Design an enzyme around this catalytic site. Structure first.
Site, PDB file in Angstrom:
ATOM      1  CG  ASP A  35      78.383 -33.308  80.719  1.00 58.77           C
ATOM      2  OD1 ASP A  35      77.317 -32.840  80.270  1.00 58.77           O
ATOM      3  OD2 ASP A  35      79.523 -33.077  80.242  1.00 58.77           O
ATOM      4  CB  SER A 199      61.640 -27.663  71.795  1.00 57.65           C
ATOM      5  OG  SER A 199      60.623 -26.851  72.341  1.00 57.65           O
TER       6      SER A 199
END
Length: 330
Positions: A35, A199
């Site tokens: 994770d 992004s």
């Protein structure tokens, strides 16, 4: 040193991935959920409340000659999905794919929430976010990666998650045969303890690319892709019959639909998520309403590049003094 381990979807939907991990001496192999959005290595154990264990493999520290109680240490964690676990702490030897760390904090669960009990395939979590998020008190502990880092050939790990197929976690090297083209690297902020990056935009299907900054985290422990409501609405508007359902808890679509791809930007590069990766199947057995793999982050407080996005790429988690993230097509 290096390590290399195969990671395997837990079910036909790729709801999560498990990777075998050796703990203790002799080795006890547990299948852990790696994770990158948390920083605790915790396991089902011989100390876990019996009624809360249902098919998981447990770690038994009393059977490990290298286990030592970390005196006074406790841990307690709550995840974004509302699940939780807590317990005490041992140090022991932990190996992943041939890479061994001695003195790793292994957090033994005394209590786990129902979601964990109900998932027989996950024996615990191995956190790979920054150690500043580790929950051990009163002395915070380091992640497996942080402990291994100095010994690694290069201070990196990579995630190469499969679509409906196994993939790989590598530590200490970049497998140049595992991706196509070049890896594009992008800046990381560690201020919230996550692999947080920006992004450069998105496209829906064959549509034009929209240049827009989208701050979010690369999180292998989250199944879906969670993005701003504007972006998510633009995606599902291209699927006839798709709608946001408050009762189900997100966007659903007719199972008869063909889903468009979704592209996200990494610098000037582009990662394309095929439409099929966005299908999470019937909302309930036999339903013709299917659950979408792109959902709104509104009310999460952060955008999350979960498995839906990451499995479309070869992803480098570069833990150099100034961390960065790399993405390649594959």
């Amino acid at each position: 040193s290096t390590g290399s381990a195969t990671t395997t979807p837990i079910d036909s939907l790729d709801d999560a991935y498990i990777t075998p991990v050796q703990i203790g001496t002799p080795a006890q192999t547990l299948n852990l959920d790696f994770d990158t959005g948390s920083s605790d290595l915790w396991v089902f154990s011989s100390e876990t409340t019996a009624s809360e264990v249902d098919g998981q493999t447990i770690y038994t520290p009393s059977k490990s000659t290298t286990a030592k109680l970390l005196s006074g240490a406790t841990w307690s964690i709550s995840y974004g999905d509302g699940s939780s676990s807590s317990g005490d702490v041992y140090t022991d030897t932990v190996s992943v794919g041939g890479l061994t760390v001695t003195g790793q904090a292994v957090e033994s669960a005394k209590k786990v929430s129902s979601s964990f009990t109900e998932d027989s395939t996950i024996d615990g979590l191995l956190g790979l976010a920054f150690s500043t998020l580790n929950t051990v008190s009163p002395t915070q502990q380091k992640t497996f990666f942080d402990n291994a880092k100095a010994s690694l050939d290069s201070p990196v790990f990579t995630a190469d998650l499969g679509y409906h197929a196994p993939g790989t976690y590598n530590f200490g090297f970049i497998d140049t045969t595992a991706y196509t083209g070049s890896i594009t690297y992008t800046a990381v902020s560690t201020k919230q303890g996550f692999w947080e990056w920006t992004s450069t935009g998105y496209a829906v299907g064959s549509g034009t690319f929209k240049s827009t900054s989208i701050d979010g985290i690369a999180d292998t422990g989250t199944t879906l892709l969670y993005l701003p409501a504007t972006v998510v609405s633009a995606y599902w508007a291209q699927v006839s019959g798709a709608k946001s359902s408050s009762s189900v808890g997100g966007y659903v679509f007719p199972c008869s639909a063909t889903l468009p791809s979704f592209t996200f930007g990494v610098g000037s590069a582009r990662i394309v998520i095929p439409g099929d990766y966005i299908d999470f199947g019937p909302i309930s057995t036999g339903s013709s309403s299917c659950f979408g793999g792109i959902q709104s982050s509104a009310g999460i407080g952060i955008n999350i590049f979960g498995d839906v996005a990451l499995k479309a790429a070869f992803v480098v988690f570069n833990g150099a003094t100034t961390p960065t993230l790399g993405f390649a097509s594959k």
